[PDB]
Amino acid sequence: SDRVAQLTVGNSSITTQEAANIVLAYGEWPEYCPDTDATAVDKPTRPDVSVNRFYTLDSKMWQENSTGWYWKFPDVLNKTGVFGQNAQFHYLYRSGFCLHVQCNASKFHQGALLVAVIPEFVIAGRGSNTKPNEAPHPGFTTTFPGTTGATFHDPYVLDSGVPLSQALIYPHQWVNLRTNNCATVIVPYINAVPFDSAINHSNFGLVVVPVSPLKYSSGATTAIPITITIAPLNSEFGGLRQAVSQ
Amino acid sequence: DPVEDIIHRAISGATNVESAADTTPSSHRLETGRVPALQAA
């Protein structure tokens, strides 16, 4: 009863047998911006079914030595779908996301992944240089990896210089191969401003880090893909202009 | 009374406004002879 579940948004639907409940981040639902909180005076557009729906990205193959991956959400969807086209033609953006991570495996496999939504996730430079002018900075494509995602060098600090053990202070869910085959989290829109640009700013990141490694026996299936599905939810756009993708 | 001709406002007013002005929702208009855009400087 609680294990089984089905979502639906737009024309897309997801069904799960073995799922464990659902995480609603910070106890609030996504909403449209209220009149009091609004600032920009133009009438925002609310596409609904054309934008809000599940989008599936390419799959990551999880291997015994895998170090984990991450994504930036008002990034991955900027070049894909109708959501991506509204984002390039509009200067202002607001929405929440419903997030779903999926990893199958047999009852003979063992391991655990930590799925976490970590707002304002800022990757850092890796090096001992204390001089600000010569200090390393983490690339463009490492900061906004796009649809393909990026992988951690040293997941223990989350590339942020911050302990992964405390990452449970963020909306998070475990996917444990013996318990559940998927993790689901709904994130309301959070930021210091009512709207914000989609192409410049990344509200929050996602982190799938293999805490307990992947282990199995000879003869079992070796290839274990990981797939993420994200639904932009309760979207808004404003500030229409010509397309700027970068 | 013996001679008649010896027998003989502003524009706006100030409103107290505590906060900046608000904005009210509007929609498209298509009709004639109503044109807020055209002004005479």
Side-chain angles (χ1 to χ4, degrees):
Chain A
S1 178
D2 190 5
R3 302 296 298 279
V4 178
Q6 179 179 355
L7 302 173
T8 298
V9 64
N11 60 347
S12 61
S13 177
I14 294 172
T15 62
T16 60
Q17 299 296 320
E18 193 172 0
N21 198 27
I22 295 172
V23 173
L24 191 145
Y26 297 130
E28 297 187 359
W29 286 95
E31 65 180 342
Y32 295 103
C33 182
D35 290 343
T36 62
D37 292 348
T39 179
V41 298
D42 63 350
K43 183 177 179 180
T45 186
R46 296 179 179 85
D48 181 62
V49 289
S50 62
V51 291
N52 297 337
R53 61 180 300 278
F54 289 103
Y55 293 90
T56 304
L57 304 176
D58 285 345
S59 180
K60 296 292 181 290
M61 188 65 71
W62 168 41
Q63 189 66 259
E64 182 276 336
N65 58 33
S66 298
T67 180
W69 301 273
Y70 64 88
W71 290 271
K72 302 296 182 66
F73 288 89
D75 182 9
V76 292
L77 294 178
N78 280 289
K79 293 176 182 176
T80 61
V82 178
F83 179 86
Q85 293 295 101
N86 286 280
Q88 295 179 339
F89 286 93
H90 290 85
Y91 169 68
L92 296 175
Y93 163 77
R94 175 184 174 93
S95 71
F97 289 95
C98 181
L99 190 150
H100 191 65
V101 179
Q102 299 167 335
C103 182
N104 300 131
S106 65
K107 297 171 180 176
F108 295 156
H109 292 81
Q110 66 183 23
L113 295 171
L114 177 65
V115 176
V117 172
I118 58 180
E120 298 300 326
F121 169 62
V122 176
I123 66 170
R126 300 174 66 249
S128 64
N129 192 338
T130 59
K131 292 179 179 179
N133 298 131
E134 190 67 14
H137 292 157
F140 174 77
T141 188
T142 305
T143 61
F144 290 170
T147 299
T148 59
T151 186
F152 294 105
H153 301 292
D154 48 356
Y156 177 72
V157 294
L158 292 173
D159 287 347
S160 296
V162 68
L164 185 146
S165 64
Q166 298 176 339
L168 277 68
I169 195 63
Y170 294 121
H172 72 287
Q173 186 163 353
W174 294 91
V175 53
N176 193 343
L177 297 179
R178 64 170 296 169
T179 299
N180 58 342
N181 59 33
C182 57
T184 302
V185 56
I186 288 107
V187 180
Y189 175 83
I190 72 173
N191 192 343
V193 292
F195 290 175
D196 193 358
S197 177
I199 60 173
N200 283 337
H201 189 202
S202 178
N203 290 132
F204 58 91
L206 181 64
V207 173
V208 177
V209 56
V211 177
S212 67
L214 181 68
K215 185 60 165 58
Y216 56 87
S217 296
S218 177
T221 301
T222 297
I224 304 300
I226 294 173
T227 302
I228 63 172
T229 301
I230 56 177
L233 196 153
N234 196 335
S235 298
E236 289 177 345
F237 299 99
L240 181 64
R241 55 178 172 80
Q242 70 280 0
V244 172
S245 178
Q246 61 181 17
Chain B
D1 184 68
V3 59
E4 187 278 335
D5 61 353
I6 63 171
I7 305 302
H8 60 283
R9 294 182 182 175
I11 291 175
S12 178
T15 300
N16 185 336
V17 53
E18 185 273 335
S19 176
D22 294 348
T23 300
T24 186
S26 65
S27 296
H28 61 283
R29 75 172 70 199
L30 50 86
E31 73 275 0
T32 61
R34 295 183 181 177
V35 55
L38 293 177
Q39 297 297 324

mmCIF file of all heavy atoms in Angstrom, chain A residues 1-9 11-22 54 56 98-104 180-184 227 229:
data_model
loop_
_atom_site.group_PDB
_atom_site.id
_atom_site.type_symbol
_atom_site.label_atom_id
_atom_site.label_comp_id
_atom_site.label_asym_id
_atom_site.label_seq_id
_atom_site.Cartn_x
_atom_site.Cartn_y
_atom_site.Cartn_z
ATOM 1 N N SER A 1 0.833 -1.196 0.000
ATOM 2 C CA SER A 1 0.000 0.000 0.000
ATOM 3 C C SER A 1 0.869 1.248 0.000
ATOM 4 O O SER A 1 0.744 2.106 -0.867
ATOM 5 C CB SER A 1 -0.941 0.004 1.205
ATOM 6 O OG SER A 1 -1.723 1.184 1.235
ATOM 7 N N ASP A 2 1.755 1.344 0.985
ATOM 8 C CA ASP A 2 2.702 2.447 1.016
ATOM 9 C C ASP A 2 3.870 2.199 0.071
ATOM 10 O O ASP A 2 4.419 3.150 -0.495
ATOM 11 C CB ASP A 2 3.198 2.656 2.446
ATOM 12 C CG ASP A 2 3.996 3.933 2.617
ATOM 13 O OD1 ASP A 2 4.096 4.720 1.657
ATOM 14 O OD2 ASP A 2 4.520 4.153 3.729
ATOM 15 N N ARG A 3 4.250 0.935 -0.120
ATOM 16 C CA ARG A 3 5.348 0.603 -1.018
ATOM 17 C C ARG A 3 5.027 1.023 -2.444
ATOM 18 O O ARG A 3 5.775 1.783 -3.069
ATOM 19 C CB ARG A 3 5.623 -0.896 -0.966
ATOM 20 C CG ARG A 3 5.948 -1.412 0.410
ATOM 21 C CD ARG A 3 7.226 -0.812 0.927
ATOM 22 N NE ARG A 3 8.360 -1.162 0.086
ATOM 23 C CZ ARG A 3 8.995 -2.324 0.158
ATOM 24 N NH1 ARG A 3 8.594 -3.244 1.023
ATOM 25 N NH2 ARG A 3 10.022 -2.572 -0.633
ATOM 26 N N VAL A 4 3.917 0.523 -2.976
ATOM 27 C CA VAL A 4 3.515 0.846 -4.334
ATOM 28 C C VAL A 4 3.105 2.308 -4.406
ATOM 29 O O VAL A 4 2.629 2.889 -3.425
ATOM 30 C CB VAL A 4 2.369 -0.089 -4.761
ATOM 31 C CG1 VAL A 4 1.888 0.233 -6.155
ATOM 32 C CG2 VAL A 4 2.819 -1.529 -4.682
ATOM 33 N N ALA A 5 3.256 2.902 -5.584
ATOM 34 C CA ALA A 5 2.902 4.297 -5.791
ATOM 35 C C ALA A 5 3.041 4.631 -7.264
ATOM 36 O O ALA A 5 3.735 3.946 -8.018
ATOM 37 C CB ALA A 5 3.783 5.237 -4.965
ATOM 38 N N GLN A 6 2.360 5.697 -7.656
ATOM 39 C CA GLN A 6 2.337 6.176 -9.025
ATOM 40 C C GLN A 6 2.281 7.687 -8.993
ATOM 41 O O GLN A 6 1.442 8.257 -8.293
ATOM 42 C CB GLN A 6 1.124 5.647 -9.784
ATOM 43 C CG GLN A 6 1.040 6.134 -11.204
ATOM 44 C CD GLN A 6 -0.153 5.576 -11.923
ATOM 45 O OE1 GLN A 6 -0.874 4.745 -11.388
ATOM 46 N NE2 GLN A 6 -0.379 6.039 -13.140
ATOM 47 N N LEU A 7 3.140 8.335 -9.756
ATOM 48 C CA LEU A 7 2.985 9.763 -9.916
ATOM 49 C C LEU A 7 2.334 10.038 -11.257
ATOM 50 O O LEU A 7 2.236 9.166 -12.118
ATOM 51 C CB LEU A 7 4.345 10.446 -9.831
ATOM 52 C CG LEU A 7 5.057 10.173 -8.516
ATOM 53 C CD1 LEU A 7 6.451 10.733 -8.563
ATOM 54 C CD2 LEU A 7 4.281 10.772 -7.376
ATOM 55 N N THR A 8 1.902 11.275 -11.440
ATOM 56 C CA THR A 8 1.493 11.723 -12.756
ATOM 57 C C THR A 8 1.651 13.228 -12.809
ATOM 58 O O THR A 8 1.284 13.926 -11.864
ATOM 59 C CB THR A 8 0.046 11.326 -13.060
ATOM 60 O OG1 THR A 8 -0.068 9.901 -13.044
ATOM 61 C CG2 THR A 8 -0.361 11.827 -14.420
ATOM 62 N N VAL A 9 2.183 13.720 -13.920
ATOM 63 C CA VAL A 9 2.137 15.139 -14.212
ATOM 64 C C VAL A 9 2.249 15.275 -15.717
ATOM 65 O O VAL A 9 2.942 14.493 -16.371
ATOM 66 C CB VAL A 9 3.246 15.903 -13.446
ATOM 67 C CG1 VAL A 9 4.596 15.459 -13.893
ATOM 68 C CG2 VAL A 9 3.090 17.392 -13.624
ATOM 69 N N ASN A 11 1.666 14.736 -19.440
ATOM 70 C CA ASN A 11 1.324 13.512 -20.140
ATOM 71 C C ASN A 11 2.188 12.333 -19.720
ATOM 72 O O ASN A 11 2.080 11.261 -20.316
ATOM 73 C CB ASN A 11 1.419 13.733 -21.647
ATOM 74 C CG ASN A 11 2.795 14.146 -22.087
ATOM 75 O OD1 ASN A 11 3.636 14.507 -21.273
ATOM 76 N ND2 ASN A 11 3.033 14.107 -23.387
ATOM 77 N N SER A 12 3.040 12.509 -18.718
ATOM 78 C CA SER A 12 3.976 11.493 -18.270
ATOM 79 C C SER A 12 3.525 10.880 -16.952
ATOM 80 O O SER A 12 2.876 11.531 -16.133
ATOM 81 C CB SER A 12 5.372 12.087 -18.111
ATOM 82 O OG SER A 12 5.375 13.117 -17.143
ATOM 83 N N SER A 13 3.870 9.610 -16.762
ATOM 84 C CA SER A 13 3.485 8.864 -15.575
ATOM 85 C C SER A 13 4.621 7.947 -15.155
ATOM 86 O O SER A 13 5.367 7.437 -15.992
ATOM 87 C CB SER A 13 2.222 8.043 -15.827
ATOM 88 O OG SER A 13 1.883 7.275 -14.691
ATOM 89 N N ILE A 14 4.745 7.736 -13.849
ATOM 90 C CA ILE A 14 5.751 6.849 -13.279
ATOM 91 C C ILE A 14 5.072 5.905 -12.306
ATOM 92 O O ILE A 14 4.244 6.330 -11.497
ATOM 93 C CB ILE A 14 6.870 7.627 -12.564
ATOM 94 C CG1 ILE A 14 7.677 8.439 -13.556
ATOM 95 C CG2 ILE A 14 7.791 6.690 -11.841
ATOM 96 C CD1 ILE A 14 8.646 9.335 -12.886
ATOM 97 N N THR A 15 5.417 4.627 -12.381
ATOM 98 C CA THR A 15 4.928 3.624 -11.451
ATOM 99 C C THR A 15 6.110 2.949 -10.781
ATOM 100 O O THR A 15 7.150 2.739 -11.408
ATOM 101 C CB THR A 15 4.079 2.574 -12.148
ATOM 102 O OG1 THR A 15 4.883 1.881 -13.106
ATOM 103 C CG2 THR A 15 2.917 3.226 -12.860
ATOM 104 N N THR A 16 5.951 2.619 -9.505
ATOM 105 C CA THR A 16 7.003 1.961 -8.744
ATOM 106 C C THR A 16 6.397 0.898 -7.850
ATOM 107 O O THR A 16 5.397 1.144 -7.174
ATOM 108 C CB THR A 16 7.781 2.954 -7.883
ATOM 109 O OG1 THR A 16 6.886 3.584 -6.964
ATOM 110 C CG2 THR A 16 8.438 4.008 -8.743
ATOM 111 N N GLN A 17 7.010 -0.280 -7.854
ATOM 112 C CA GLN A 17 6.639 -1.334 -6.923
ATOM 113 C C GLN A 17 7.244 -1.076 -5.550
ATOM 114 O O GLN A 17 6.533 -0.920 -4.555
ATOM 115 C CB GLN A 17 7.118 -2.683 -7.456
ATOM 116 C CG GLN A 17 6.525 -3.098 -8.788
ATOM 117 C CD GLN A 17 5.045 -3.319 -8.722
ATOM 118 O OE1 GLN A 17 4.532 -3.866 -7.751
ATOM 119 N NE2 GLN A 17 4.342 -2.902 -9.760
ATOM 120 N N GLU A 18 8.567 -1.029 -5.496
ATOM 121 C CA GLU A 18 9.357 -1.173 -4.284
ATOM 122 C C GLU A 18 9.692 0.168 -3.625
ATOM 123 O O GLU A 18 10.492 0.204 -2.689
ATOM 124 C CB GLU A 18 10.620 -1.970 -4.631
ATOM 125 C CG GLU A 18 11.425 -2.503 -3.474
ATOM 126 C CD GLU A 18 12.543 -3.429 -3.914
ATOM 127 O OE1 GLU A 18 12.683 -3.658 -5.132
ATOM 128 O OE2 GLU A 18 13.284 -3.927 -3.042
ATOM 129 N N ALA A 19 9.110 1.265 -4.098
ATOM 130 C CA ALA A 19 9.427 2.592 -3.579
ATOM 131 C C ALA A 19 9.153 2.699 -2.083
ATOM 132 O O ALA A 19 8.268 2.036 -1.543
ATOM 133 C CB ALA A 19 8.609 3.653 -4.307
ATOM 134 N N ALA A 20 9.925 3.555 -1.410
ATOM 135 C CA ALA A 20 9.707 3.856 0.002
ATOM 136 C C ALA A 20 9.279 5.312 0.139
ATOM 137 O O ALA A 20 10.106 6.223 0.070
ATOM 138 C CB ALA A 20 10.964 3.575 0.814
ATOM 139 N N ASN A 21 7.993 5.510 0.368
ATOM 140 C CA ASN A 21 7.305 6.772 0.650
ATOM 141 C C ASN A 21 7.733 7.861 -0.343
ATOM 142 O O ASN A 21 8.133 7.563 -1.471
ATOM 143 C CB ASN A 21 7.541 7.102 2.104
ATOM 144 C CG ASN A 21 6.569 8.119 2.627
ATOM 145 O OD1 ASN A 21 5.456 8.240 2.128
ATOM 146 N ND2 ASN A 21 6.972 8.842 3.652
ATOM 147 N N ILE A 22 7.712 9.121 0.090
ATOM 148 C CA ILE A 22 8.069 10.272 -0.739
ATOM 149 C C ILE A 22 8.547 11.374 0.192
ATOM 150 O O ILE A 22 7.973 11.583 1.262
ATOM 151 C CB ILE A 22 6.876 10.761 -1.595
ATOM 152 C CG1 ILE A 22 6.436 9.733 -2.628
ATOM 153 C CG2 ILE A 22 7.250 11.997 -2.337
ATOM 154 C CD1 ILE A 22 5.166 10.107 -3.331
ATOM 155 N N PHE A 54 7.464 14.875 -16.639
ATOM 156 C CA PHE A 54 8.707 14.190 -16.320
ATOM 157 C C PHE A 54 9.632 14.154 -17.524
ATOM 158 O O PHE A 54 9.217 13.813 -18.632
ATOM 159 C CB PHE A 54 8.439 12.774 -15.827
ATOM 160 C CG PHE A 54 7.817 12.715 -14.474
ATOM 161 C CD1 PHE A 54 6.476 12.444 -14.316
ATOM 162 C CD2 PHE A 54 8.590 12.908 -13.350
ATOM 163 C CE1 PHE A 54 5.922 12.381 -13.066
ATOM 164 C CE2 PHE A 54 8.039 12.853 -12.103
ATOM 165 C CZ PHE A 54 6.703 12.591 -11.962
ATOM 166 N N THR A 56 13.371 12.512 -18.651
ATOM 167 C CA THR A 56 14.354 11.501 -18.301
ATOM 168 C C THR A 56 15.668 11.831 -18.988
ATOM 169 O O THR A 56 15.692 12.109 -20.189
ATOM 170 C CB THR A 56 13.875 10.115 -18.719
ATOM 171 O OG1 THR A 56 12.605 9.854 -18.112
ATOM 172 C CG2 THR A 56 14.846 9.069 -18.255
ATOM 173 N N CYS A 98 9.835 18.059 -8.981
ATOM 174 C CA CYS A 98 9.619 16.727 -8.440
ATOM 175 C C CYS A 98 10.684 15.812 -9.018
ATOM 176 O O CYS A 98 10.835 15.724 -10.236
ATOM 177 C CB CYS A 98 8.230 16.204 -8.785
ATOM 178 S SG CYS A 98 7.889 14.571 -8.124
ATOM 179 N N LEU A 99 11.421 15.141 -8.147
ATOM 180 C CA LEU A 99 12.627 14.427 -8.532
ATOM 181 C C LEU A 99 12.496 12.947 -8.214
ATOM 182 O O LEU A 99 11.977 12.575 -7.162
ATOM 183 C CB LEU A 99 13.821 15.004 -7.808
ATOM 184 C CG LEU A 99 15.200 14.560 -8.236
ATOM 185 C CD1 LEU A 99 16.088 15.720 -7.966
ATOM 186 C CD2 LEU A 99 15.653 13.366 -7.438
ATOM 187 N N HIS A 100 12.988 12.106 -9.117
ATOM 188 C CA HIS A 100 12.887 10.665 -8.949
ATOM 189 C C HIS A 100 14.180 10.030 -9.436
ATOM 190 O O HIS A 100 14.597 10.279 -10.569
ATOM 191 C CB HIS A 100 11.682 10.131 -9.727
ATOM 192 C CG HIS A 100 11.331 8.712 -9.423
ATOM 193 N ND1 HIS A 100 10.887 8.304 -8.186
ATOM 194 C CD2 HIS A 100 11.333 7.610 -10.205
ATOM 195 C CE1 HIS A 100 10.643 7.006 -8.215
ATOM 196 N NE2 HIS A 100 10.907 6.561 -9.428
ATOM 197 N N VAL A 101 14.814 9.221 -8.591
ATOM 198 C CA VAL A 101 16.016 8.480 -8.950
ATOM 199 C C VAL A 101 15.673 7.000 -8.940
ATOM 200 O O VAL A 101 14.901 6.544 -8.096
ATOM 201 C CB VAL A 101 17.181 8.778 -7.986
ATOM 202 C CG1 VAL A 101 18.400 7.973 -8.356
ATOM 203 C CG2 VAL A 101 17.501 10.241 -7.999
ATOM 204 N N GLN A 102 16.249 6.251 -9.878
ATOM 205 C CA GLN A 102 15.859 4.869 -10.121
ATOM 206 C C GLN A 102 17.104 4.016 -10.279
ATOM 207 O O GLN A 102 17.910 4.273 -11.174
ATOM 208 C CB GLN A 102 15.017 4.785 -11.388
ATOM 209 C CG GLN A 102 13.750 5.575 -11.321
ATOM 210 C CD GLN A 102 13.119 5.731 -12.667
ATOM 211 O OE1 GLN A 102 13.796 5.661 -13.685
ATOM 212 N NE2 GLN A 102 11.817 5.954 -12.688
ATOM 213 N N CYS A 103 17.275 3.013 -9.422
ATOM 214 C CA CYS A 103 18.306 2.006 -9.630
ATOM 215 C C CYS A 103 17.745 0.638 -9.293
ATOM 216 O O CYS A 103 17.395 0.377 -8.140
ATOM 217 C CB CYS A 103 19.541 2.300 -8.780
ATOM 218 S SG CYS A 103 20.885 1.128 -9.020
ATOM 219 N N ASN A 104 17.662 -0.232 -10.287
ATOM 220 C CA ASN A 104 17.291 -1.620 -10.078
ATOM 221 C C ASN A 104 18.499 -2.441 -9.657
ATOM 222 O O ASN A 104 19.645 -2.080 -9.920
ATOM 223 C CB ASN A 104 16.697 -2.220 -11.342
ATOM 224 C CG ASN A 104 15.475 -1.490 -11.789
ATOM 225 O OD1 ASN A 104 15.346 -1.130 -12.959
ATOM 226 N ND2 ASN A 104 14.567 -1.241 -10.859
ATOM 227 N N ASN A 180 14.524 -0.558 -1.256
ATOM 228 C CA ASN A 180 13.776 0.142 -2.283
ATOM 229 C C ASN A 180 14.638 0.303 -3.522
ATOM 230 O O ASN A 180 15.862 0.392 -3.435
ATOM 231 C CB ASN A 180 13.321 1.507 -1.789
ATOM 232 C CG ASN A 180 14.473 2.370 -1.347
ATOM 233 O OD1 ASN A 180 15.566 1.878 -1.094
ATOM 234 N ND2 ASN A 180 14.243 3.669 -1.276
ATOM 235 N N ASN A 181 13.995 0.317 -4.680
ATOM 236 C CA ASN A 181 14.703 0.492 -5.936
ATOM 237 C C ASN A 181 14.653 1.917 -6.469
ATOM 238 O O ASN A 181 15.155 2.162 -7.565
ATOM 239 C CB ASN A 181 14.172 -0.487 -6.986
ATOM 240 C CG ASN A 181 12.698 -0.325 -7.251
ATOM 241 O OD1 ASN A 181 12.152 0.774 -7.188
ATOM 242 N ND2 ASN A 181 12.040 -1.430 -7.558
ATOM 243 N N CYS A 182 14.046 2.854 -5.744
ATOM 244 C CA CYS A 182 13.967 4.219 -6.243
ATOM 245 C C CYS A 182 13.813 5.196 -5.088
ATOM 246 O O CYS A 182 13.364 4.835 -4.000
ATOM 247 C CB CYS A 182 12.812 4.387 -7.228
ATOM 248 S SG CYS A 182 11.221 3.936 -6.561
ATOM 249 N N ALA A 183 14.184 6.446 -5.353
ATOM 250 C CA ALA A 183 14.105 7.533 -4.390
ATOM 251 C C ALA A 183 13.385 8.710 -5.025
ATOM 252 O O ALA A 183 13.598 9.010 -6.199
ATOM 253 C CB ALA A 183 15.486 7.965 -3.923
ATOM 254 N N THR A 184 12.541 9.377 -4.247
ATOM 255 C CA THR A 184 11.688 10.432 -4.775
ATOM 256 C C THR A 184 11.668 11.606 -3.815
ATOM 257 O O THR A 184 11.450 11.421 -2.616
ATOM 258 C CB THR A 184 10.261 9.924 -4.996
ATOM 259 O OG1 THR A 184 10.283 8.812 -5.896
ATOM 260 C CG2 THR A 184 9.393 11.019 -5.586
ATOM 261 N N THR A 227 19.364 5.934 -13.391
ATOM 262 C CA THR A 227 18.595 6.856 -14.208
ATOM 263 C C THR A 227 17.862 7.829 -13.301
ATOM 264 O O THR A 227 17.339 7.438 -12.257
ATOM 265 C CB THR A 227 17.601 6.096 -15.091
ATOM 266 O OG1 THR A 227 18.309 5.161 -15.909
ATOM 267 C CG2 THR A 227 16.857 7.042 -15.989
ATOM 268 N N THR A 229 14.929 11.044 -13.145
ATOM 269 C CA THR A 229 13.776 11.625 -13.813
ATOM 270 C C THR A 229 13.344 12.847 -13.030
ATOM 271 O O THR A 229 13.171 12.772 -11.811
ATOM 272 C CB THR A 229 12.625 10.627 -13.906
ATOM 273 O OG1 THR A 229 13.054 9.473 -14.631
ATOM 274 C CG2 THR A 229 11.455 11.243 -14.618
#
